[PDB]
């Protein structure tokens, strides 16, 4: 069975500018099986009700999802994206910088 | 709009 | 300017938890507008574009029908890949379906496409001739004798012609106000020291649609692609897409270094650089 790990890219939707309200998104590609745990961490801690698209794919089959929810950034708080997937031995944090 | 028929593998 | 209509459809077995989830959708170009998913509570094809809302009840109770039978048989093809392959009842296994049309300016099909993949691999795929096929393996080949025997290309061939390219007509007009704009990509370089002696710039594109662009880094006027981190293009979640292109720059080359812009909503490509 083939398998095919996921890219993950944790980003906000606008530039950030501490204490406006904006979205953050954590997008995952290229992964097969489509099977997929993602989380978005707000200061380590797993945050409540996050939306995610409805599954799709690429030209070359692969899936990509997109998991987001709204959030006000601040100098301190951290984000962050944990994503499970049969490729990974253990679950891979991605940490929000907002230069990326 | 969406092809119509049901076409088995 | 050119078009694309495109329909997604992924089953997925999960054998011991009940049957395969269905989830469909289909887009134009970059859009999604209907979805259809076999685990919402009173499974339908529902509307995820403004323009497509004003589609009266006949069409959502056709289309609702069609996805529905493509659910019932998407698990039978499961049930038949697993003797292909002489497979268990055990796994989970995934069937994939896409097919569409492209059109240019005068909407008549440029391309079509009806391509199935499963697990995760090529199966069969109508050829650009809309009349003959590309089946992957030996499998797959049965499938394809089984098709062309009852004749499944031609009936694929006037769909793909005829009503896809129709319908996609009949959406551009209705979603005239976004599916034909272009947001053409707001552009700025920004740089990260990594250490004493270079800094990363990135070159940022945020806030276009659609999809497509083209972003490169070039040195003295030659191509940076073995030294640029591309990353994969991104939904930004306001229809809009976000992409960048970084290099590790020496002290001192900063503006050695041109960042390139390639849209369709920019007129003419971009040339940028840092600025300090």
């Given amino acids: 069975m083939i398998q095919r790990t996921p890219k993950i890219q944790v980003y906000s939707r606008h530039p950030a500018e501490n204490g406006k309200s904006n979205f953050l998104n954590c997008y995952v590609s290229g992964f097969h099986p489509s099977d997929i745990e993602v989380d978005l961490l707000k200061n380590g801690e797993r945050i409540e009700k996050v939306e995610h698209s409805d599954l799709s794919f690429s030209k070359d089959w692969s899936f990509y999802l997109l998991y987001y929810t709204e959030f006000t950034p601040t100098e301190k708080d951290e984000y962050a994206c944990r994503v499970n997937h049969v490729t990974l031995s253990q679950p891979k944090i991605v940490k929000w910088d907002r230069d990326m | 709009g969406r092809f119509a028929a049901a076409i088995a593998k | 300017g050119s078009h694309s209509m495109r329909y997604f459809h992924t089953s997925v077995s999960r054998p011991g938890r009940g049957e395969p989830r269905f989830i469909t959708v289909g887009y134009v170009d970059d859009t999604l507008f209907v979805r259809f998913d076999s685990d919402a509570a009173s499974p339908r094809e529902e509307p995820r574009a403004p323009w497509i809302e004003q589609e009266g009840p006949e069409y959502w109770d056709r289309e609702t029908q069609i996805c529905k039978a493509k659910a019932q048989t998407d698990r039978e093809d499961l049930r038949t890949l697993l003797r292909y392959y002489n497979q268990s009842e055990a796994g989970s296994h995934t069937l994939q379906n896409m097919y569409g049309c492209d059109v240019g300016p005068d909407g008549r099909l440029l391309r079509g496409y009806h391509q199935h993949a499963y697990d995760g691999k090529d199966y069969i795929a109508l050829n650009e001739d809309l009349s003959s096929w590309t089946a992957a393996d030996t499998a797959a080949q049965i499938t394809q004798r089984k098709w062309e025997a009852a004749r499944v290309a031609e009936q694929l061939r006037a769909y793909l012609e005829g009503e896809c390219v129709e319908w996609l007509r009949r959406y551009l007009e209705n979603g005239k ?100």
């Avoid at chain 3, 990594?194 to 649609?209: K, Q, V």
């Avoid at chain 3, 981190?229 to 590790?248: I, N, Y």
């Avoid at chain 3, 720059?249 to 490509?269: A, F, M």
């Fill in chain 3, 177 to 276: 106000e976004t599916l034909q704009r272009a947001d053409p990509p707001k552009t700025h370089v920004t740089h990260h020291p990594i250490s004493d002696h270079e800094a990363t710039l990135r070159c940022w594109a945020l806030g276009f649609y659609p999809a497509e662009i083209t972003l490169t880094w070039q040195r003295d006027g030659e191509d940076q692609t073995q030294d640029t981190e591309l990353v994969e293009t991104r939904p930004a979640g306001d229809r809009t897409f976000q992409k960048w292109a970084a290099v590790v720059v020496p002290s001192g080359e900063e503006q050695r270094y041109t960042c390139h812009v390639q849209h369709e909503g920019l007129p003419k490509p971009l040339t940028l650089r840092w600025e300090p």
